């Protein structure tokens, strides 16, 4: 282990954690809190960004001087991926779109780009790789999202055999598109059962998966502590928010139940206690204001 990557300090902002992290997709929602929790340890966070540099400004106070290296990359340029990962000791993937675009479909975002990142990270000597799938990923799933994400998970597993693949159920938080989706829909109630996971629990799970050497080659299912039906969940969202852009793929995924995978470990086997919805939903939905808790199963 090299002398510059030995940890030092008391784990604060000016400390050294020995984590040289390349977070693909740090400009989004999971990457926000992930770069926050990495940089507050004193980790060398490499942020490959695709967007305008203005849209990366919030990542800049998240660490000490020189501890966030921004650089350009393309999903169809393996040279830029190698230019981003050739010094990192961990590579986290967080590339995702809820909607397919003119230049990237779900096959590009969930299959081609994660396999490219994992292949280049294998042939660059990166120790640790973390992939973020979805809990309901299935080949025979109704939505194209979960089909291509199951395909990309299989490809990441077969091209990086030690890839820590993580299954969040439905991540809620401030900049989420789950509770902010329900508070701004003003779809319906069915027999769909969900257990949504909190974003800080997911971030602590990812960083404890970095820190646990036994999490290599594993597959985790980051689920919340309380399973809810869809209907009383949506009624609880409209009860907290003081209320009386979509596609059919999101309609299929909201009416897709969060499956139970007891053979996979979860948040507790990384040392993270799951934060329930009712302690954070007021914090999420206070912005939407111009409460009896939901029924669990």
């Amino acid at each position: 282990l090299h002398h510059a990557v030995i940890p030092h300090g008391k784990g604060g902002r000016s400390s050294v954690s020995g984590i040289v992290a390349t977070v693909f997709g740090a400009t989004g929602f999971l990457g926000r809190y992930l770069v926050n929790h990495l940089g507050r340890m004193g980790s060398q966070v490499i942020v490959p960004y695709r967007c305008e540099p203005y849209d990366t400004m919030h990542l800049r106070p998240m660490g000490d001087l020189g501890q966030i290296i921004f650089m350009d990359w393309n999903g169809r340029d393996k040279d830029s991926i190698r230019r981003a990962v050739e010094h990192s000791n961990v590579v986290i993937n967080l590339v995702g779109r809820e909607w397919e675009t003119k230049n990237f479909d779900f096959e590009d975002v969930f299959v081609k780009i994660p396999q490219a990142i994992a292949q280049v990270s294998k042939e660059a000597g990166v120790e640790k790789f973390i992939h973020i799938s979805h809990l309901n990923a299935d080949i025979k799933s109704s939505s194209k999202y979960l089909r291509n994400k199951a395909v990309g998970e299989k490809e990441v597993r077969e091209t990086f055999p030690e890839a820590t693949i993580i299954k969040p159920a439905d991540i809620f938080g401030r900049e989420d598109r789950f509770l902010n989706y329900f508070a701004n829909i003003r779809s319906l109630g069915k027999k769909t059962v969900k257990q949504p996971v909190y974003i800080v629990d997911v971030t602590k799970g990812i960083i404890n998966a970095i820190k646990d050497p036994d999490a290599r080659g594993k597959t985790f299912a980051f689920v919340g502590p309380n399973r809810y039906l869809l209907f009383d969940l949506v009624q609880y969202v409209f009860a907290v928010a003081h209320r009386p852009w979509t596609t059919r793929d999101k309609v299929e995924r909201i009416h897709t139940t969060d499956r139970t995978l007891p053979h996979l470990p979860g948040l507790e086997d990384l040392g993270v206690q799951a934060t329930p919805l009712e302690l954070k939903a007021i914090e999420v939905l206070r912005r939407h204001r111009t409460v009896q808790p939901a029924k669990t199963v």
Partner: protein
């Protein structure tokens, strides 16, 4: 008819500009803003003086409403009576102002 067309045109231009001001920058997909004053949450204290200057406006505006036919009233044949009643109306407006003065009605908004 020309005036109604003009009023409708001005209202339509104003509503078009207001709609462009309230809906063109809505298409910006900037960011959701988390958690969007000298007094914190106290009630608005009623000021007696603001109500006093408003009612003084209303009463002197009524006296103005009496004064408004004077450019037409100077054309009369009974000019002595007209001149007496015009000077009497402006004098009663001045007596209203003097009484508003001397009983401390014009105070702290003088």
């Amino acid at each position: 008819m020309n005036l109604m067309i003009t009023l409708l045109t001005n209202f339509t231009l104003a509503t078009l500009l207001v709609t462009i001001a309230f809906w063109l920058p809505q298409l910006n997909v900037y960011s959701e803003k988390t958690s969007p004053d000298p007094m914190g949450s106290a009630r608005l204290p009623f000021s007696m003086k603001f109500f006093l200057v408003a009612i003084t406006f209303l009463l002197f505006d009524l006296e103005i409403a009496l004064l408004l036919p004077l450019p037409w009233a100077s054309q009369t044949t009974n000019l002595n009576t007209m001149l007496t009643m015009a000077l009497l109306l402006i004098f009663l407006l001045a007596v209203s102002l003097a009484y508003e003065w001397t009983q401390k009605g014009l105070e702290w908004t003088e």
